[PDB]
Design an enzyme around this catalytic site. Structure first.
Site: not given
Ligand SMILES: Nc1nc2c(ncn2[C@@H]2O[C@H](COP(=O)(O)OP(=O)(O)OP(=O)(O)O)[C@@H](O)[C@H]2O)c(=O)[nH]1
Ligand SMILES: [Mg+2]
Ligand SMILES: Nc1nc2c(ncn2[C@@H]2O[C@H](COP(=O)(O)OP(=O)(O)O)[C@@H](O)[C@H]2O)c(=O)[nH]1
Ligand SMILES: Nc1nc2c(ncn2[C@@H]2O[C@H](COP(=O)(O)OP(=O)(O)O)[C@@H](O)[C@H]2O)c(=O)[nH]1
Lengths: 409, 426, 35, 32, 426
Positions: A43, A116-117, A226
């Site tokens: 995205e 997914g990503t 280490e």
């Molecule tokens: N610690 C932390 N976790 C995040 C953050 N944003 C998303 N997450 C975690 O990411 C998980 C979902 O994946 P995302 O990163 O939001 O989306 P993605 O991994 O890019 O996958 P897509 O939606 O298909 O693009 C959720 O369970 C959130 O807990 C963040 O800013 N900080």
């Molecule tokens: Mg995402």
């Protein structure tokens, strides 16, 4: 000596957006970071927020990789259908980042396995990195989904299918939940209404505390090689609980008397772990203690003695010398707008135990229940998968549970 | 980047779409003359999802009006935000079906569906990365239901990978305008279960009931009802148009709420909705938004979700809010009301947060619950359908047009097997 | 007409729910001794 | 009309019983 | 944290509560608009007990108005501080009971009380730690007595572990507004002795007596009576809202004044209450507050305690005072008049001091005495009940609604054994 960082996904590059802010604010010592980074996502919305943000000119334009359309919380989509066109462009850049480098310690990857990503093309990137370099370390700081706090629905499917590759690809894997961090910000930081930004700020603190040994000269330095020996007693057991101390506000910090003895204790209570699990059920296999700032070797030495003589926590029967210490001179820096007060000294502890064997077992039922009725499976199968890899990833976690139970005995 | 082509069919589709393009044009800061006049930078970089830059800052919508009677086209062209469409996109027949599904699906559609397909193709390949199409129609009328349904089938034959949203209203016996409502709605659903990607079910009982009880309007004309439906449609595609702390596109919501491929009929709700006299007597917090969300008397369908169980649920939030409060609120409603949720699925709630509120508000929310209470309407319809078809009422108006008796039996069969699978999964 | 079948469905479901409610009361009463 | 009253009474009773069941389930979770 | 939800029933409840919300809001420095305009930071620390912040300084009262005729609801929104109540909290019937306790408890209650319960639930769960509920009503009318008493019974079986105050004026022969006063009072008291935690007896006769001698008012309308009652209610719950040298909460008062679970009928008085002609000639010390407190002609009931015996008594003091003086005055009034006190309980008086006076005075006090002389009202009411019921007067308006004869005999027995049981401990 330099180490480059890869960031995948919505969670990955937001963690990086806070991590790199700390690196620039902290800084020849810079040579290990100055950036040697790559953001990549499917995205374009979050990457192009960086492209127009305050750090427009800081990042070279090509670095910020961005696909055309999202995998949409679909491991198969982000691993078989859409990954196949972007992963080649990403790793064929990271190569020339390594050729720019000469003394590469390793790579460090940031991803969340729920999406997914972060999960799909995370594993895909890891598989081509392992066949291309093999020997060079790849530290993966992943974000696993919490037991009771959750944002998605199909994340058990993603977390199991991602783990099957996180075993034999990454070298050192640090778990991090969201409920545990939410509890940390609620308990110690007394922030009753936290958002993702505050979580990412203190995640960067942990990363900085384990690379400061390369960047700055300490009394006892420790490289990334280490951790490779001192904490993983078996080639397939590398999953680390994390903790940090003192996580403390701006006013409480002055009131309290931070020292080495009590923060070595505070870094061991389950009220301060970065992963929602109780290590009282488990036995510590090994511990690693990074000390930053105003530390003499005596009191760190005295502190590990008191831990060993306590009986509230136990060690495996195998390790009398179950610790690895490390001391660095420069104190931790602060970010304006951050919530952590300036401290003379801080401790980041990375341990390994059998408490992690509980999270996988907890994960199994949720995945098992949905899979038995074949919920949501039609999305992944039409993407390119089959029933084979669902069942085989299931039995891989079953083997891991027996493995932890065997080693813990 | 990601692209949404708009298609409106029939009188219901045209007037719903008219109010829709009014609120979207205001959100992107475009004047009724077609030129940009907004203030924030954020409103420029994501107008290609809904508009095309023509020449001299002329942003024309990517929409297609479609009907069989000129009254709706002239009323559209007359009012404001009527001179922003391209006159070539007003694809338009001349005879009119008139609440006869056979006319709109076999006889009159046969000469219009060619022209709409020409326009939608040229309008589709004009943009680079299509996200999907967005259709607004009815299931009681003829030129809305029949032609719109046939257009859905032809589009899914050409573009089988692209997404598809359908905002469709269904008839209910308490608000029954035409006499042949069951004959149309039953046949229309037969095609929707196999062609659409997901269908957000609407109805006029809940809409009239909402404006009575919660909004406390005195004279709820179609303008206010169409205003509410448009606010739902803007909320469902706010993630593409604006950056947020957690993004959820169309495909992302579809995979998290559809556990089985034929189970894609949703209920919709919008919050906050408060009377004008009480707008200042309230806070604006996440718990307040959640109490109004999970109220069963707030769905925009006439199907009480507490008459069944939720399979999944979704909440799209807009505004500066803490993600922890979002997850804690979803977990709280998941534990206290444990019987109303399915057991062999933990985490029946997907959540998402966008950083840009709708204009005039501070924080809003959109609920999409895929419940098993939706089967009552299909039974509520099928009992009427059998009442007519046991005795061939009004049947010749369709039979002498091409439908045979097997078509109606097939529609009953698909309706009956569907209500059994909802009952199975409850 | 069809309401005659609806009353059967609603009656049987209500009776089965009472059986679930009964068993749950014993469960909480069983845990309260263990506490 | 009689059967209609039976319908609107059985559902209300059914609804009250479902609410009580949720309460019991919540107590078990807290107590465990 | 400690929280009180307020409930007003019937016409009597609505005027009492109306003047009450003006007095509290003026104490916390909130103007009729409902926005904060005070100066002291102390006034903001303890507004969670009675109000909710809505937005931009808007504070809404945590109250529920409940009645059957719209004349009272419109009279509330008309007057000042009428625009502060949330309009949704005006839960409200339409037909009217009209001084018929059976109509208030069996016919119209059965369809209004589910609504008022749902509002109360939202108001109770909106806050965190309930201290209790606060209900103001009368015992002569129908929509206050029967409906309000049913509300009390329903609430007590919902939240059994929380306190509950009810302020009830009771009928007397000298102030006889309706004709069936005893038939309403006897059935209402039967339910109060088994449901309410503690009651505070009031009457209109004593209030008229107070306005004649002490206030020396020319035209005592109902506004002044409601003013006295409001000052009492503010005085008793002042401890939760302001800090003091010796704080005494509602539960602390209940356990200190109720020796036996059935002996929970108190008579209340308030000081200082002086006419404008003599308010200039007065002094403000502790002895002058006490000897005006413990005067029999200052009680707000027509039950002279020297015709009985004191079980326990309580005084809630407000203003910067010396606690030594407080205790020695209670000691003096208990040692001299030792016969008026119970013998098997030493130190019959609970005392407390709070450090915030009401506006317009430098020092005030509030007396709550649990005497045994309250039985004068029970005998005084039961004989009028007997005088009609021996002969079956007015009975058919009660009988033809669902009540039978054993309800009156059971109510007679319970009231009669109650006055008997007060007499035994006397
Ligand atoms: N610690 C932390 N976790 C995040 C953050 N944003 C998303 N997450 C975690 O990411 C998980 C979902 O994946 P995302 O990163 O939001 O989306 P993605 O991994 O890019 O996958 P897509 O939606 O298909 O693009 C959720 O369970 C959130 O807990 C963040 O800013 N900080
Ligand atoms: Mg995402
Ligand atoms: N919400 C809404 N519903 C409408 C509107 N116009 C018609 N309807 C509904 O559409 C149904 C009739 O559909 P119709 O207009 O005849 O469809 P068409 O003839 O195929 O274009 C009726 O049940 C109406 O309730 C409108 O402007 N707004
Ligand atoms: N103190 C006071 N008492 C009132 C007021 N209005 C009515 N009453 C009392 O209410 C009693 C009659 O009850 P009513 O108002 O008919 O109760 P309802 O019909 O149940 O609401 C009379 O004995 C009055 O003394 C008022 O403004 N102040």
């Amino acid at each position: 000596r330099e180490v480059i960082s890869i960031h995948i996904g919505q969670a990955g590059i937001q963690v990086g957006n806070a991590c790199w802010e700390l690196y620039c604010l902290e800084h020849d010592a810079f040579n290990t970071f100055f950036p040697r980074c790559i953001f990549l996502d499917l995205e374009p919305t979050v990457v192009d927020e960086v492209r127009t943000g305050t750090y427009r000119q800081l990042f070279h334009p090509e670095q910020l990789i961005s696909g055309k359309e999202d995998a949409a919380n679909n491991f198969a989509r982000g691993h078989y259908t859409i990954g196949k066109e972007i992963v080649d462009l990403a790793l064929d850049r990271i190569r020339k980042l390594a050729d720019n480098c000469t003394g590469l310690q390793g790579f460090l990857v940031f991803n969340a396995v729920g999406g997914g990503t972060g999960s799909g093309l995370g594993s895909l990137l890891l598989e081509r990195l392992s066949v291309d370099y093999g020997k060079k370390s790849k530290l993966g700081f992943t974000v696993y989904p919490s037991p009771q706090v959750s944002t998605a629905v199909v994340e058990p499917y993603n977390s199991v299918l991602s783990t099957h590759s996180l075993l034999e690809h990454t070298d050192v894997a640090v778990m991090l939940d969201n409920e545990a961090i939410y509890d940390i910000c609620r308990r110690s930081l007394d922030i009753e209404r936290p958002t993702y930004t505050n979580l990412n700020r203190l995640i960067a603190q942990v990363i900085s505390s384990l690379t400061a040994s390369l960047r700055f000269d300490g009394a006892l330095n420790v490289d990334i090689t280490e951790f490779q020996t001192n904490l993983v007693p078996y080639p397939r057991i590398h999953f680390m609980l994390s903790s940090y101390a003192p996580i403390i506000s701006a006013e409480k910090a002055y009131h309290e008397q931070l020292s080495v003895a009590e923060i070595t204790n505070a870094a061991f209570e389950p009220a301060s772990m970065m992963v929602k699990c109780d290590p009282r059920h488990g036995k510590y296999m090994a511990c690693c203690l990074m000390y930053r700032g105003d530390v003499v070797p005596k009191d760190v030495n005295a502190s590990v003695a008191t831990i060993k003589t306590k009986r509230t926590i136990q060690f495996v029967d195998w390790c009398p010398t179950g610790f690895k210490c490390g001391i660095n001179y420069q104190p931790p820096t602060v970010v304006p707008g951050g919530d952590l007060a300036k401290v003379q000294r801080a401790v980041c502890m990375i341990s390994n135990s059998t408490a992690i064997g509980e999270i996988f077992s907890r994960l199994d039922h949720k995945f098992d229940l949905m899979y038995a009725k074949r919920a949501f499976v039609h999305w992944y199968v039409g993407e390119g998968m089959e029933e084979g890899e669902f069942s085989e990833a299931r039995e891989d976690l079953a083997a891991l549970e027996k493995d932890f139970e065997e080693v813990g005995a | 980047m990601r692209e949404i082509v708009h298609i409106q069919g029939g009188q219901c589709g045209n007037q719903i779409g008219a109010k829709f393009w009014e609120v979207v044009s205001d959100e992107h800061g475009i004047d009724p003359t077609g030129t940009y006049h907004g203030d924030s930078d954020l409103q420029l970089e994501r107008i290609n999802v809904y508009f095309n830059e023509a020449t001299g800052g002329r942003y024309v919508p990517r929409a297609i009006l479609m009907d069989l009677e000129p009254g709706t086209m002239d009323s559209v062209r007359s009012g404001p935000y009527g001179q922003i469409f391209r006159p070539d996109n007003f694809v338009f027949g001349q005879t009119g079906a008139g609440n006869n599904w056979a006319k709109g699906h076999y006889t009159e559609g046969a000469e219009l569906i060619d022209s709409v397909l020409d326009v939608v193709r040229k309008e589709a390949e004009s943009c680079d990365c299509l996200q999907g199409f967005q259709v607004c129609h009815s299931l009681g009328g003829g030129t809305g239901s029949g032609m719109g349904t046939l257009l859905i089938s032809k589009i899914r034959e050409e573009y089988p990978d692209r997404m598809m949203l359908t905002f469709s209203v269904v008839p209910s016996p308490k608000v029954s305008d035409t006499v042949v409502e069951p004959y149309n709605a039953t046949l229309s659903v037969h095609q929707l279960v196999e062609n659409a990607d997901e269908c957000m079910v609407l109805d006029n009982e809940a809409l009239y009931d909402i404006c009575f009880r919660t909004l406390k309007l005195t004279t709820p004309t179609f303008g206010d009802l169409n205003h509410l439906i448009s606010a739902v449609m803007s909320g469902i595609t706010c993630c593409l148009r604006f950056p947020g702390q957690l993004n959820a596109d169309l495909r992302k919501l579809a995979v998290n709420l559809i556990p089985f491929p034929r189970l894609h009929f949703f209920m919709v709700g919008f919050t906050p909705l408060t009377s004008r006299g009480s707008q200042q007597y309230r806070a604006l917090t996440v718990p307040e938004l959640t109490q109004q969300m999970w109220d069963a008397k707030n769905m925009m369908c006439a199907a009480d979700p507490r008459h069944g169980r939720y399979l999944t649920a979704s909440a799209l939030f807009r505004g500066r809010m803490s993600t922890k409060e979002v997850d804690e609120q979803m977990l709280n409603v998941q534990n206290k009301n444990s019987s109303y949720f399915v057991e062999w699925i933990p985490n029946n709630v997907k959540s998402s947060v966008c950083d840009i509120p709708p204009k005039g508000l501070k924080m809003s929310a959109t609920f999409i619950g895929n419940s098993t209470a939706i089967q009552e309407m299909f039974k509520r319809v099928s009992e009427q359908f059998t009442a007519m078809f046991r005795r061939k009422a009004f049947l010749h108006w369709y039979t002498g047009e091409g439908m045979d008796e097997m078509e109606f039996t097939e529609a009953e069969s698909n309706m009956n097997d569907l209500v059994s699978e909802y009952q199975q999964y409850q | 007409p069809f309401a005659q079948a609806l009353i059967n469905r609603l009656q049987d479901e209500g009776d089965m729910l009472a059986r679930k409610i009964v068993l749950e009361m014993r469960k909480t009463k069983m845990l309260d001794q263990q506490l | 009309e009689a059967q209609q009253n039976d319908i609107k009474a059985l559902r209300r009773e059914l609804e009250l019983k479902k609410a009580k069941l949720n309460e019991l389930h919540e107590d078990v979770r807290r107590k465990e």
